[PDB]
Amino acid sequence: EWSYTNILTGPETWHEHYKNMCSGYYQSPIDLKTDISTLDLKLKTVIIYRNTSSTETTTIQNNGHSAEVKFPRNTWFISFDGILDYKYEIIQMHFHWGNTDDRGSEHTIDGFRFPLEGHIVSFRRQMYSSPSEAIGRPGGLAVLGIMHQIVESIKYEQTAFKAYNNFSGVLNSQFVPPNNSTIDDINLALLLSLLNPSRYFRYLGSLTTPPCTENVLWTVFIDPVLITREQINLFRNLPYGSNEKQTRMGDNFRPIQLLNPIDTLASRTLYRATARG
Amino acid sequence: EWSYTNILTGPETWHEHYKNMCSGYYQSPIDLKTDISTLDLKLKTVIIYRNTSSTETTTIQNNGHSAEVKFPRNTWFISFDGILDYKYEIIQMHFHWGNTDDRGSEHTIDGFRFPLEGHIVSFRRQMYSSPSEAIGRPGGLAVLGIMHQIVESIKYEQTAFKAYNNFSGVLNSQFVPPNNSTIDDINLALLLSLLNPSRYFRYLGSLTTPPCTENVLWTVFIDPVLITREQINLFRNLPYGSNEKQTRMGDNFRPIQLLNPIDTLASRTLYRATARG
Ligand SMILES: NS(=O)(=O)c1ccc(CCN/C([SeH])=N\c2ccc(I)cc2)cc1
Ligand SMILES: NS(=O)(=O)c1ccc(CCN/C([SeH])=N\c2ccc(I)cc2)cc1
Ligand SMILES: [Zn+2]
Ligand SMILES: [Zn+2]
């Protein structure tokens, strides 16, 4: 299959093992360059919102490459246009992090890596009726990237882990793949309120794992939410799957792709949003 | 379930009848605006080329919406990069025309409508192993648009119909849907030589019939190839399918779409190409 740390199956090989579409020219992640991006004032504040009549359980799984929160259907949503009419429905949230505090994110901002990048994955329910219809089809997906940065002095209640409800304690050395547990729901609205939801990069790109499908509308918020060293080390306690060379989970990020590889047949543009000033 | 001329199922209904993806904001055709386009000097001359070991027959069909030439698999190819390594494989070519000489094309160039636009449809064999795998998948298709203009004085051999080998004389009132006929092969290399293959518009868009899939790399050549009044009339003798109101096939084109409708979440750019000069 594929891995992050086994040189035989790792990211440098994906273009060959998964030509469709890891060999394409609209890949992610990229370096988000503030100076080489176009400000687009039409891009509105992002809203995350919940169907309050949903009662189904949230679960989490160590799938061998990340910790992935699976949300029940019809429960959490994204609006990019201020209307709460269920155009984008959230499916899951997973994470990318480093062996050390100075790396881990997949995207960079002006060359800078964060310790932890969370990915809220949604499908365009406006057009497609289910996650499995959308996931392999054009324009099917929209992902939100949330950067986290480590602070030494902070109350629990002001960290991202309050929104995550500490993942109900599941991040530990005994959370072996492919175990899954029920967890308290993640308050994704609170999470979003920990940063500026108007201030983000926006571009068309891909999944960052095989098969690297080029059907993702990316939104990467510029301001990070805050965590402690203790919290980042929790993720580091998870074991990798048996496909990986490294034992403990870490450095589960894809290397940086160019916005426009030289063989592109139609250049893409990196956009930036900011609040109505 | 769709038509051009029957108001129950015509183009104004497709946004509603085929939400995925005729309701999208990366639709085709568009007005190709010379002033509001970005010149990109990296976009190279287009080459069309044949596999000379191929012997299978070419056919043409009245499918009720157009005349469609169907090429055998593994026979005709496009290269956008100068390498003849089968990255794009040609599937079919079909046509859009008007009831009258002053309309017919799907794309316009600076608001101008041509009497006939041909579409040479290919799949990205580089990533996808068959047409049916590519047709519904991200980035699966590339279409070349060839404008045709009517002239009064020309030798047959210098008209696009020479490249088409007159469609082997098959076009007449009795060529009813869904009949197909064997025809002499189309010399697509001659066709391309009748215009400047370095001079074109390029953008990411969609199929121009339902379901309007947003997975088409578009290339529309700026210079038209030339035909006669008699030749355009050959198309107009074809009968439309029963789902249409009009009897004789014509005005089989979709209305112009905006490059960036107001609901877009990431603007696209119209590019143009010209020869190394
Ligand atoms: N990284 S991403 O946001 O572009 C991304 C988002 C979704 C998918 C679809 C398949 N993957 C599913 Se359903 N779950 C996982 C996702 C990532 C990882 I690492 C592990 C499991 C791939 C990649
Ligand atoms: N017009 S286009 O280049 O964007 C285009 C190209 C391919 C398709 C896929 C389905 N239809 C197939 Se495979 N063939 C036909 C195409 C057009 C017509 I009118 C009639 C038949 C749709 C549309
Ligand atoms: Zn991810
Ligand atoms: Zn067409």
Structure overview:
The structure is a homodimer of 277-residue chains. By secondary structure, chain A is an alpha+beta fold. Helix content of chain A is 11%, strand content 27%. The first copy, chain A, contains 6 helices and 15 strands. Chain A has helices spanning 14-17, 19-22, 131-134, 160-164, 188-193, 229-236, and strands spanning 31-32, 38-39, 47-50, 58-62, 67-70, 76-79, 88-97, 108-109, 116-124, 141-150, 180-183, 200-205, 216-221, 225-227, 271-273. In chain A, the strands form 2 sheets. In chain A, strands 2, 3, 4, 5, 6, 7, 9, 10, 11, 12, 13, 14 and 15 form a 13-stranded mixed beta sheet that branches. In chain A, strand 4 (58-62) and strand 5 (67-70) form a beta hairpin. Chain A binds chain B through residues 19-21, 23-24, 26, 40, 43, 80-81, 126-128, 136-139, 142, 202-204, 213-215, 217, 262-267, 269, 271, and chain B through 19-21, 23-24, 26, 40, 42-43, 80-81, 126-128, 136-139, 142, 202-204, 213-215, 217, 263, 265-267, 269, 271. Bound molecules: ligand TN8 (2 copies) and zinc ion (ZN) (2 copies). The site of one copy of the ligand NS(=O)(=O)c1ccc(CCN/C([SeH])=N\c2ccc(I)cc2)cc1 has 14 residues of chain B, from strand 7 and strand 9. Chains A, B: Zn(2+) 3 binds at residue 65. Chains A, B: It catalyses: hydrogencarbonate + H(+) = CO2 + H2O. Chains A, B: Belongs to the alpha-carbonic anhydrase family. Chains A, B: Glycans are attached at residues 51, 166, 180.
